[PDB]
Design a protein around this ligand. Structure first.
Ligand SMILES: CC(C)(C)NCCCNC(=O)c1cccc(I)c1
Lengths: 119, 120
């Protein structure tokens, strides 16, 4: 029906990763208003949005941690705890839990989901 | 005595909120290149930068959680675990742990620290 209200990962800047967010409006012209998990709002083109909630298992992602901006890993599990999604990210045979907000996609990583989940 | 490499919380303008980041370069004219914890890098005015690392105790902050964008609380503790900073945020007599990345400041909350920690 309508994509309003659905969670997504979307790239809002040219030099940008894909970040967890939520569609809030269909603003026409192939654009949607997005609400990122950090509270920032802006319009984003459909081609720059991946309709993923959660990011699928076996997906290569970037898991953010303090002083780590490019740590790549593979999603191997999801878990709901007190209404919050957690990702189990495998890196070098070891799995660690990350909150939804900390799991992002580089350009190359997002392009692998574009054909199946892009708008 | 330079500011490059120091962690900060810096305003975003579009919404007025201060986010956790790091000064990576002095670009002149009172501006600094800032790398936010999410990996986005841009120039920011010094008056919009708070030299807070960590955000001091008893500060009123906004603590992000899933589908929560305006939940306010008070910092009552800090904890380093595996080289990562965690904030203990009190709200309604209960405390919960948040990672550095999830603790932000609204414009009003950040203005309370401008006098003491701002780079204006
Ligand atoms: C407004 C700025 C430029 C700070 N971010 C916008 C895009 C990222 N939004 C997020 O959801 C997020 C996730 C983790 C950490 C941080 I900081 C932000």
């Amino acid at each position: 029906n309508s994509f309003v209200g659905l969670r997504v990962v979307a790239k809002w800047s040219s030099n940008g990763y894909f970040y967890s967010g939520k569609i809030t409006r269909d603003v026409g012209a192939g654009k949607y208003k997005l609400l990122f998990d950090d509270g920032y709002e802006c319009d984003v083109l459909g081609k720059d949005i991946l309709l993923c909630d959660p990011i699928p298992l076996d997906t290569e992602v970037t898991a953010l941690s303090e002083d780590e901006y490019f740590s790549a890993g593979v999603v191997k599990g999801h878990r709901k705890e007190s209404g919050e999604l957690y990702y189990s990210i495998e890196k070098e045979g070891q799995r660690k839990w990350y909150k939804r907000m900390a799991v992002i996609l580089s350009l190359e990583q997002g392009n692998r989901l574009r054909e199946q989940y892009g708008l």
